[PDB]
Design a protein around this ligand. Structure first.
Ligand SMILES: O=C(O)c1ccncc1
Ligand SMILES: O=C(O)c1ccncc1
Lengths: 132, 132
């Protein structure tokens, strides 16, 4: 039945299994979907969120290799607007966890979940606790 | 035309863009392929190659999220045998760079290439040279 357009934005820095579980989840919200991933720009991220270690090109080249990803918007806008939804014909925005209030109010919000500990920072911890 | 079975084995530890470029390359050796990825066991790797930081389960869960990967054998045998080719009906083995001599001799070897510097170890270097 109807193909549903899903939009998930993020930094997607040092992409780990937690990101991928999230993308798979968005991708499978409905039986027939197109998953659009948005990749935040270097400057906006570092100005609003924090340090990023991978460039925009690098963070986006990786997402191209993920099975669940159908389209990539890179760079994507930092805030999602109603115009943005209409331009890309987006039916739902998928993200963890108001700045999402207006999307919930419109019934266009689908919550997805983070997976803890599986991150690339916590992997060096493992390498490092080879040493007392 | 004919669907070609491709087999690429590896450790696939802390999967980076270099691994993924390799898998994409194997996947696209022929127009119609099935790419089988083999994931080496924890013990055999640590006994023959070196330390691995991710478990077998973890290294395999990640590969499931890669677009190019059609089938996963986990754990895969450490050495590839002619029996192994017949059991999984494999037409070509894809790997970098003899222990591949017999496969070349049989015309069943397809070379793929590593991409340098894009590895997860070299990313902490980048984080770290935030400090003089
Ligand atoms: O990663 C995030 O929370 C984010 C997503 C989209 N725009 C800005 C930040
Ligand atoms: O990563 C490798 O070189 C390897 C591949 C398959 N069997 C053992 C080692």
């Amino acid at each position: 039945s109807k193909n549903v357009v899903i939009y998930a934005d993020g930094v997607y820095d040092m992409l780990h299994l937690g990101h991928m579980k999230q993308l798979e989840q968005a991708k499978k919200l409905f039986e027939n979907t197109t998953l659009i991933v948005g990749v935040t720009s270097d400057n906006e991220t570092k100005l609003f969120k924090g340090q990023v270690v991978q460039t925009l090109e690098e963070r986006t080249e990786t997402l191209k290799h993920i099975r669940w990803v159908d389209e990539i918007i890179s760079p994507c806008p930092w805030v999602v607007t109603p115009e943005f939804l209409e331009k890309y014909k987006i039916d739902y925005v998928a993200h963890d966890d108001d700045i999402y209030a207006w999307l919930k109010r419109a019934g266009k919000f689908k919550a997805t979940q983070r997976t803890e500990g599986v991150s690339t920072t916590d992997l060096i911890v493992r390498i490092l606790k080879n040493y007392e």
